[PDB]
C-alpha cells in the first residue's frame, strides 16, 4: 500500500538477525493503532504471527518479536532458520481509509547459496511480429540470488510504466533464479523512439540493457 510501506525483500544467513520495517503514517501507526504481522509460507495461506505489536500466538516461536516506535513498526527475527523463508505482511487500522490497511509485503530469503548478480538479455520486436501490427520487447533476467529483483523501463531516457508486465522469479536448472519483463507497444511507438532500456535492480546494483529501433531491423 501507500499508507503502510515495507521493503520488498530482505535476506540473511541462518543464525543471524534481521528486521522488517513497517513504515506507517500519522493516520495509522502514529495515531497509536496496534500493529499486526502475518507470515505467508510459500503456497500456503497467511497465518497470524504478531498481534498487539508484541504478542505471539501459541504456535509462534520466540525468535519472532515486534515493536513500534511512533509512526513505524518493526518485526525482528533473531536466529534465522530455513523454514522462515516466507512473505511477511504488517497491518494496522487507518483513520483516513476508515479501514484495515496492509503493507505491500516483504520476501524474506534465508541465504542457502552465494548471492549472484543477474544477467540480462533484451530482445527487440521481431520482424514477424511487426508485420502483424504488434510489437513487444522481451527482457529476460537470469542467474541471480536471492530471488528478488526490480525491473524498470525507459524510452529515450524517460521512464515508461504503461504496458509493462513482469513475472516473479522461479528456480532455474542451477537452483538460481530467473524472471522476465515485457514492454508492449504499437509498431509506431517502437519506430518513433530512438532507444529503449531495461533496468534490473538487485542488491543495490543495477544492470541496464539497450536496444535501438534503427539497428537490427
Amino acid at each position: 500500500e501507500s499508507v503502510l510501506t515495507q521493503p520488498p525483500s530482505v535476506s540473511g544467513a541462518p543464525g543471524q538477525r534481521v528486521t522488517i520495517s513497517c513504515t506507517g503514517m500519522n493516520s495509522n501507526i502514529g495515531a497509536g493503532y496496534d500493529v499486526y504481522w502475518y507470515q505467508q509460507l510459500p503456497g500456503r495461506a497467511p497465518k497470524l504471527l504478531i498481534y498487539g505489536n508484541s504478542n505471539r500466538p501459541s504456535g509462534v516461536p520466540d525468535r519472532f518479536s515486534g515493536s513500534r516506535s511512533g509512526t513505524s513498526a518493526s518485526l525482528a527475527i533473531t536466529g534465522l532458520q530455513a523454514e522462515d523463508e516466507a512473505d511477511y505482511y504488517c497491518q494496522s487500522y487507518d483513520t483516513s481509509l476508515n479501514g484495515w490497511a496492509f503493507g505491500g509485503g516483504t520476501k524474506l530469503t534465508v541465504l542457502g547459496q552465494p548471492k549472484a548478480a543477474p544477467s540480462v538479455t533484451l530482445f527487440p520486436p521481431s520482424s514477424e511480429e511487426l508485420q502483424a501490427n504488434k510489437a513487444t520487447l522481451v527482457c529476460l533476467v537470469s542467474d541471480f540470488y536471492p530471488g528478488a529483483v526490480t525491473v524498470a523501463w525507459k524510452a529515450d531516457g524517460s521512464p515508461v510504466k504503461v504496458g509493462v508486465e513482469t513475472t516473479k522469479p522461479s528456480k532455474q536448472s542451477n537452483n538460481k533464479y530467473a524472471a522476465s519483463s515485457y514492454l508492449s507497444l504499437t509498431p509506431e511507438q517502437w519506430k518513433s523512439h530512438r532507444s529503449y532500456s531495461c533496468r534490473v535492480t538487485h542488491e543495490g546494483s543495477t544492470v541496464e540493457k539497450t536496444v535501438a529501433p534503427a539497428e537490427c531491423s
Binding site: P46, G99, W100, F102, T121, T136, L140, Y182, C216
Partner: protein
C-alpha cells in the same frame, strides 16, 4: 481442530455476481467477528471487509474498493459467513480468504487480529475466449551474445487459457533451455517466452525450432528461429 472452509471459486464473467460461503467448525462461531481478505495473483494482501459479532449488532464495514458492490452476512445457526460479490470487475480477480477475528484481551480492550485463516478460494473474472497463440522468433545476434554463447528464443503471445508447453528441436535440445512463466496482459490474454543458450560458433550450422503446444485450442506451432547477421 479449528477450521474455516471457503467455496464458490471459479471463472466468472465481468459484471456478474457470485456468493462465497465460508463454513466454520471447532469453535463458537457466534462469539467471533469474521473478516474477508483477498490476494491478487503474485501480489499482496488486501482487506475486503468484515462483519461484527452477533452481540455487537452484526454490522458490516467494507473496504473502499468493494463498497457498494460486495456485501457480507452471517448465519449463526449454520456457522457460515458469506461474501456476496456483485458487479464484478477484472481487478477483483484474487484468492479470497475467510478469516476469524480474535478475542484476545489486551490492556483495557480486545485485539482484532485475524487469528484463523481458511485455505482460500480462487475467483477469476475474465471475458477472454479460447485462442491459440502466436509464436514469434527471438532472433539471436551480436546484441544477444555475451562472449561465446548466444541466446535465442520464441515469444508465445496472445493465448487463452493456460497452459502452453514449449520444447526445442522436438525435445532433443534440453541443455540451456529456460521457459518462463506467463504474464497476463490487460487484454486478458497470456504471453510467455522460452529462451535457449547455444554456442555462437554453431549458430549458422545448426537449426533451432521451438515446439509450442496449446492443448486448450488443439494448436501446435513449430517455429524456426533464424540468426540475424548483425
Amino acid at each position: 481442530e479449528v477450521q474455516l472452509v471457503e467455496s464458490g471459486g471459479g471463472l466468472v464473467q465481468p459484471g456478474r455476481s457470485l456468493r462465497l460461503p465460508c463454513t466454520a467448525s471447532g469453535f463458537s462461531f457466534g462469539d467471533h467477528a469474521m473478516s474477508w481478505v483477498r490476494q491478487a495473483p503474485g501480489k499482496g494482501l488486501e482487506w475486503v471487509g468484515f462483519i461484527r459479532k452477533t452481540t455487537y449488532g452484526a454490522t458490516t464495514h467494507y473496504a473502499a474498493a468493494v463498497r457498494g458492490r460486495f456485501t457480507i452476512s452471517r448465519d449463526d445457526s449454520k456457522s457460515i459467513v458469506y461474501l456476496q460479490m456483485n458487479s464484478l470487475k477484472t481487478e477483483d480477480t484474487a484468492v479470497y480468504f475467510c478469516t476469524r477475528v480474535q478475542l484476545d484481551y489486551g490492556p483495557g480492550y480486545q485485539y482484532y487480529g485475524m487469528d484463523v485463516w481458511g485455505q482460500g478460494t480462487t475467483v477469476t473474472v475474465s471475458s477472454a475466449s479460447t485462442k491459440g497463440p502466436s509464436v514469434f522468433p527471438l532472433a539471436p545476434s551480436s546484441k544477444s551474445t555475451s562472449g561465446g554463447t548466444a541466446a535465442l528464443g520464441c515469444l508465445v503471445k496472445d493465448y487463452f487459457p493456460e497452459p502452453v508447453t514449449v520444447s526445442w528441436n522436438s525435445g532433443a535440445l534440453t541443455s540451456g533451455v529456460h521457459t518462463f512463466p506467463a504474464v497476463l496482459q490487460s487484454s486478458g490474454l497470456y504471453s510467455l517466452s522460452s529462451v535457449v543458450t547455444v554456442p555462437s560458433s554453431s549458430l549458422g550450422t545448426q537449426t533451432y525450432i521451438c515446439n509450442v503446444n496449446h492443448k486448450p485450442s488443439n494448436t501446435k506451432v513449430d517455429k524456426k528461429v533464424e540468426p540475424k547477421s548483425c
